[PDB]
Structure formats: structure tokens, C-alpha cells
């Protein structure tokens, strides 16, 4: 039944998910427009922890002697203290990070940080480190503009929908929303410099890889997502063995849209 109901569903060349009638089922495959093969459980660091520890991790204040990036972290360090124009970029950055935190907390209400997302950023950084033999002693050759702006740029190229118009462009922004919270959380200035200790080259390479990887991760028009979905529920149903009616018989109850159900219950 799951198969025969979903057979004719597939991703079209407009990233839309339609049936044999061309009736839209999903506007973008699985609300994100990604192929599930290219997805991995990743941590959204921005979501959890104390408001205090967030600040320690993410805050750069070039106008405070104890909250500036130490000149040990980057070469610019000494000439960076007090740069008001640069602080406008780090305020921009930190403001966006706090924005993300509140948004993520709206989405995942319990504060669940681990979500399946495309592009394993943890690994790109791991690999950037052995690839470039990152010296956790010497200071980076990165500018704040190099970091802040480079990340802002990479985001514009994380394409999922291509059309030149408001609807499709707003649609692209939407589809990419979460991935960028992750992106922004993992590529914040302090983080890049203090944690990853990346060089400009390492950083440029991390960025290029995220891009390439992301693009690969998108669903292929032609992908027969209907039969996939049907079988992806069908097969696990096969291996199946307060007290509410569950398992095979509840799944049965659900697909039938059974009115006179076995265990009705409210959770007040």
C-alpha cells in the first residue's frame, strides 16, 4: 500500500516533489532539498550551554583589553585592539550568533543539539589540520575581514534553488536557514582562531570544501523519492515485534485513518 500510494512521486528539475498529476507534494524534497545519503548527525553548539559559556566561546570585543583576540592567536592582534570599524563586524557576527541561538531554541524546543545535516564540518576542519599541519603555537595569517566576510560569502554560494525571482530566492534562503546556523556556529571568528587555529590557506580550503560538499549533497532531479519513502518505512515495519496500542497494529491503524481506534488518549 505504501508503495502503490507513493510510486509516481519524484523530484523534478525545479527541486519540487510531484506526482503523475504534477500536483506538488513537497515544495522542496524533505523540506531541505538534500539527498539523505549525504546527511550526517551534527551538533549545533549555539543551541545549548549557559548564556555565559556561549559568550566565552563566541565573543570578540576588540574594544576591551581582556575580550580581544590575543596577538598570539593572529598576527593582526596588536594593531587590532580598539579598531572601532572592525568591532562593527564582530558585533554584526555576535548579534547573528545570538539571533541563531534564539531561533534554534524555537525549532528544537527541548534543546536537542544533534541533528542530521549535510557536510560534516567537524571532519573538514580535522582534515584541514592534517592537510596543512596546523601549528597550534604560531599565530594565524587571517584578518577578521578574511574570517567574517569569507563565511558571509560562502553562504551565498550554498545553492539549492536557482531561479532569478523573489519567491525562489526567498525559498533558497529558507531551505538553507539551518545549515547556516551550523555554519555560523562552527566558523565564528574566535572559534576559527582559538580552537581550529586555521591559517588563511587552511580556512580558504575549508570554505571551498564545505561549498563543493554541500553542492554534492543536494537531491538529483529524477530521484524516485516516493518508492524510496514507501520502502524506507515498509522495510523497517517488517522487522517489528500508560499502555497505548503501538507497533505493527498502530501503524496499521494510522495508514487506514482508522476512526474507531484502540487506545484513544489525551496528554493534558
Amino acid at each position: 500500500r505504501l508503495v502503490k500510494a507513493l510510486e509516481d512521486i519524484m523530484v523534478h528539475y525545479d527541486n519540487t516533489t510531484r506526482n503523475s498529476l504534477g500536483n506538488v507534494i513537497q515544495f522542496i524534497y524533505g523540506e531541505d532539498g538534500m539527498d539523505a545519503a549525504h546527511i550526517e548527525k551534527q551538533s549545533l553548539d549555539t543551541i545549548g550551554g549557559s548564556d555565559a559559556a556561549f559568550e566565552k566561546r563566541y565573543r570578540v570585543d576588540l574594544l576591551n583589553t581582556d575580550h580581544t583576540l590575543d596577538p598570539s592567536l593572529l598576527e593582526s592582534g596588536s594593531e587590532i585592539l580598539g579598531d572601532l570599524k572592525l568591532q562593527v563586524l564582530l558585533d554584526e557576527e555576535y548579534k547573528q550568533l545570538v539571533k541563531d541561538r534564539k531561533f534554534l531554541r524555537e525549532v528544537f524546543v527541548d534543546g536537542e543539539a544533534n541533528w542530521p545535516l549535510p557536510v560534516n564540518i567537524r571532519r573538514i576542519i580535522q582534515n584541514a589540520q592534517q592537510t596543512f599541519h596546523i601549528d597550534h603555537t604560531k599565530p594565524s595569517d587571517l584578518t577578521i575581514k578574511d574570517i567574517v566576510l569569507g563565511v558571509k560569502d560562502l553562504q551565498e554560494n550554498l545553492l539549492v534553488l536557482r531561479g532569478k525571482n523573489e519567491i525562489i530566492q526567498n525559498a533558497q534562503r529558507d531551505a538553507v536557514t539551518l545549515f547556516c546556523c551550523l555554519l555560523r556556529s562552527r566558523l565564528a571568528t574566535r572559534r576559527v582562531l582559538q580552537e581550529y587555529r586555521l591559517t588563511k590557506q587552511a580556512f580558504d580550503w575549508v570554505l571551498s570544501n564545505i561549498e563543493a560538499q554541500f553542492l554534492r549533497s543536494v537531491v538529483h532531479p529524477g530521484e524516485m523519492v516516493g518508492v524510496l519513502a514507501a520502502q524506507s518505512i515498509g522495510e523497517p515495519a517488517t522487522q517489528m515485534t500508560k499502555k497505548v496500542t503501538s507497533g505493527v497494529p498502530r501503524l496499521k491503524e494510522i495508514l487506514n485513518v482508522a476512526k474507531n481506534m484502540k487506545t484513544p488518549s489525551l496528554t493534558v
Binding site: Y13, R162, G163, K164, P221, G222
Partner: protein, 84 residues
């Protein structure tokens, strides 16, 4: 109706299916004694000849990509990116 080259908006990259069907097609054509657009550097299997043709983007084929409405965008195997 046929979307103009300057108004195309489908992936600039080649889908898994496109590539599979191109290779299948060239392999079939090569196997049916069609003219080969590249030096077979000792090659004898028509699929391996096809992969060599697609490798040098020396395949004279065009993917006509139909949209749900019925319109379409034509893309050359020369122009499509092969990140697969």
C-alpha cells in the same frame, strides 16, 4: 515550449541519472560501430571508451530536461559539471 539558454535555472551540474544514461548511450553507440571522438589509448570496452569521451567532454550529446509543465532546458554534456 523550450526555455532559452540565458533563462535556464536547473543544476549546472550533471545528475547521477544523466551521466549513467549518457555513458549507456555512448557505450551502446560505440558498440554499434559509431564514430569515436577520442584516441582509444588501447581501449576496447565501449563503456570505458564512453567514459574517456565524457572525460574530455568530447561527447556530442544534449540532455533535454523536461519541467513538470512540459517546457524544457537543453544542456550539452560539454557544459554540465561532473562533480559526481
Amino acid at each position: 515550449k523550450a526555455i532559452p539558454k540565458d533563462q535556464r535555472a536547473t543544476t549546472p551540474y550533471m545528475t547521477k541519472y544523466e551521466r549513467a544514461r549518457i555513458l549507456g548511450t555512448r557505450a551502446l553507440q560505440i558498440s554499434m560501430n559509431a564514430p569515436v571522438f577520442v584516441d582509444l589509448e588501447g581501449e576496447t570496452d565501449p563503456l570505458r571508451i564512453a567514459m574517456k569521451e565524457l572525460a574530455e567532454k568530447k561527447i556530442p550529446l544534449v540532455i533535454r530536461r523536461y519541467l513538470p509543465d512540459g517546457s524544457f532546458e537543453d544542456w550539452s554534456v560539454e557544459e554540465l559539471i561532473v562533480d559526481l
